[PDB]
Amino acid sequence: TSQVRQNYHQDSEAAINRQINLELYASYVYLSMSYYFDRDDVALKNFAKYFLHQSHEEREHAEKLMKLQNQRGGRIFLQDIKKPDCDDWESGLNAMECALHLEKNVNQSLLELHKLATDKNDPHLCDFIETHYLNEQVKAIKELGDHVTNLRKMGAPESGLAEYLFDKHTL
Amino acid sequence: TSQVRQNYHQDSEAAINRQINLELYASYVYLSMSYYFDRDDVALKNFAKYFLHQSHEEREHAEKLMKLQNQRGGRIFLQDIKKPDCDDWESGLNAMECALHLEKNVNQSLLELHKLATDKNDPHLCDFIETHYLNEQVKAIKELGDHVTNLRKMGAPESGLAEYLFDKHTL
Amino acid sequence: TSQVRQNYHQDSEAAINRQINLELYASYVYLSMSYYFDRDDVALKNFAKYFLHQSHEEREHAEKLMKLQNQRGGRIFLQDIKKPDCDDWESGLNAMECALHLEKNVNQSLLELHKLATDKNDPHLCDFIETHYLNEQVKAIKELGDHVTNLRKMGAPESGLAEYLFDKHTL
Amino acid sequence: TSQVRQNYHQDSEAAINRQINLELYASYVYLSMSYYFDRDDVALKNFAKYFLHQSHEEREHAEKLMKLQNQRGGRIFLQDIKKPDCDDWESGLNAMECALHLEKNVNQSLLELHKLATDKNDPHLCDFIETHYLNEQVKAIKELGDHVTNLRKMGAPESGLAEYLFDKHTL
Amino acid sequence: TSQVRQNYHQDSEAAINRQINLELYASYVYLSMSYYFDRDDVALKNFAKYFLHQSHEEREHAEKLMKLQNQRGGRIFLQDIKKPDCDDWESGLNAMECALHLEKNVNQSLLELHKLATDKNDPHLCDFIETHYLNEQVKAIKELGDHVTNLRKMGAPESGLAEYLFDKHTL
Amino acid sequence: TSQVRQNYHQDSEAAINRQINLELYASYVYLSMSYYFDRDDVALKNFAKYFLHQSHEEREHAEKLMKLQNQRGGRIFLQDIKKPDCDDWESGLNAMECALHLEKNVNQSLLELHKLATDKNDPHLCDFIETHYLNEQVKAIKELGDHVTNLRKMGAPESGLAEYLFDKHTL
């Protein structure tokens, strides 16, 4: 080769292609959780609005990594998007716990991308990872921890009143 | 079973689940075409804006079919989303022709869904298909036909001036 | 030295220096309690806002006593600020009870400062203590008593729902 | 362990606890200098306003480091705040020189915190130190150097007219 | 040495002095290209406006590096500014290609400055280079690549209609 | 060659090319003086603002002479820009005196350009020199004379108070 390429290694180009796929998979999981809480025998409408908002945000993360791949002069390659593991998520607390567990895996993958960019001496890429991706993750993990703690103390999951009232007063 | 179900057959419930998957696949194809025209050795920015807009619309079609599945009392089941057939779309006219060919398949599948809903005597579902899906498709097919006709008459694809000027004046 | 000094005894000058230190110590205790309720396994955000507000107010009390020491012609002398007794405050009701117990000690010290100013025949100082410090304390003690009474009646501390709901509706 | 902790070493957790104490000590020194210039036999009111502003800012630095310690999942531990070395600061130029000498020690401690965070491979923490603490220090050191240079050239400290006029025209 | 110097090595001071000269040279080249397109037998007025804009921006970059050298406590030393290599730039496409080739050299020099600042353990300087210089360069290189690609496809340089229409519709 | 040339002699075309170089050299001298007064052991901020303004004006003078060379049908030829004679200007009065001495040389060169244009019978060029360049110079020389006179009477350069107060009240 590209007429704009300068100081961009092949291994970095492949690791960006793996991160794009992982962000699209996260968007698909949040879409599944949103439409579980809209069923007539669950019926919790602010849980549903919250998960549809997280799904719209993961898609923007993936689109911004594609724009970076074109700005540096590499080529995009897409794979299949696997379906999520559960079809039914059982309650509000169990879904908040699965969301926490998924955000920690995404953070672990971003840390190794930063390490590899540091070994090839590529400062523009390190700064991109720090400026746009790496403080957003810690804020998301902190907020999910708070939600799980409150729901356990109110008395869930053996208490329907607890989840009704958390739905009204926090979300 | 559900406490709201009334006059909703098992075969209709399975065909809605297939239509959801097909709309998500169309959204992923348009996303691929958008970021091909943003490369530095193609560089046609209004083609790119047009395909990103079509991609945002297919996702809204799929979400509305999910809301219908929950209103009638059926259960949603998701599958894998396959990747698109091309990685490189070769030109501005070839991408418009592939888009036309994709929209005619989606229209053909909606016609058989309508026929099956007519054979089980389900009027609410027939009216839903007519009111939200069936005139949008014919409008989209007409607009793509116009674009292909103009691009062939201007002199594409063996003429770069032709696609530059169509990009500026029509899109 | 002093060219402004008139009718200001040495013992009053030393007792003002002790009161300055006590107000700074109270500010540091409230700062500790504020950041306990911000931890991820406690997570009660209006308790945290309330204690950070009390901490900002104790610092203004101390600064106003320093301005008085300079207006009368005495000299300020600072000591070390000791650290608070607890690191972990254990619950929402226990922290309100410790706050009540701290405000009664501060009120007891202000009463002896007033008595000593009365024995040296110093009316400007007596009036300063009455106008700015002595009705604020009784208002603070009354409000903390109300909070403790309500929290005990709702069912705390063996009930997480009780503190969740007090956090939302009163604070 | 904490349910949010990921990639946060014990030694970093102890060094953050030392930095919190150092920022609170700096706030206490600036508070002492502010109320020296308010005495009736010094009487320089813009020096006093300037040092009270610096004291309000050091307290915000310390509070932001406490919020970071809770966001990553470590535990805060407080110590005593020592009193400052001087009770009487002697002149307007001598106080600016002591302020410069204190800001260079705070900068030296931030540099070693950055080095230790680099040895444990912790990029979120390095970026926090760079974004919020490390250009503020160089700006503060540059401004104090300018003030000292001007005061020495005007003729201080053996000239009362010099400090009167610097108080009116610069501060 | 200086009373503000802390952790600033001699080799970094010399390398900043070389970068200042390079930015001034780039400003002079863009000024030459601007007034070539204003001649009466070339006469392309939006090419001329575009190159005057780039010339003002390079001068701003050089002035900001001088402010940094004074903030850290080093001393500025200026050299002669050489004249550019061409007097006549021959067409619009050839001038866009020379501009691309110049921006890649400036980017290479910034990368070696970052490497040297990393070897002496100087984090304030690394962060300055990343925050103000490294993403601007990649954006400029991407935009010049797009321009060259479009101009070759329209039919330049053996086509005057092509450059007339690009001047009118893009610049 | 030119199709617009009429009554424009070769010697005038060469003398305009020398004047362009001289105005760019003056712009570079004023840029050096501006960043001397921004050092931390000089620290006089209105002297610095004044010299940066003069530097921005000399560049507009040079650009307007280039536009004239293209309007009459001659060709521009650039040379190297030499560095200024001093690196350190040592005081405020000494820098005002060097600025006065520079403006008288520029005025002397404009007078000989006018004389040569009068010998070849070229009235458009004589009128251009009178309308845009010749009353600006006498205004600049008068203002610098006033500044030098006031600074000598106040007591500079063996008096730092004098330059502090001139910086505040005049500039």
Ligand SMILES: [Fe+2]
């Ligand atoms: Fe046209």
Ligand SMILES: [Fe+2]
């Ligand atoms: Fe309630």
Ligand SMILES: [Fe+2]
């Ligand atoms: Fe004055």
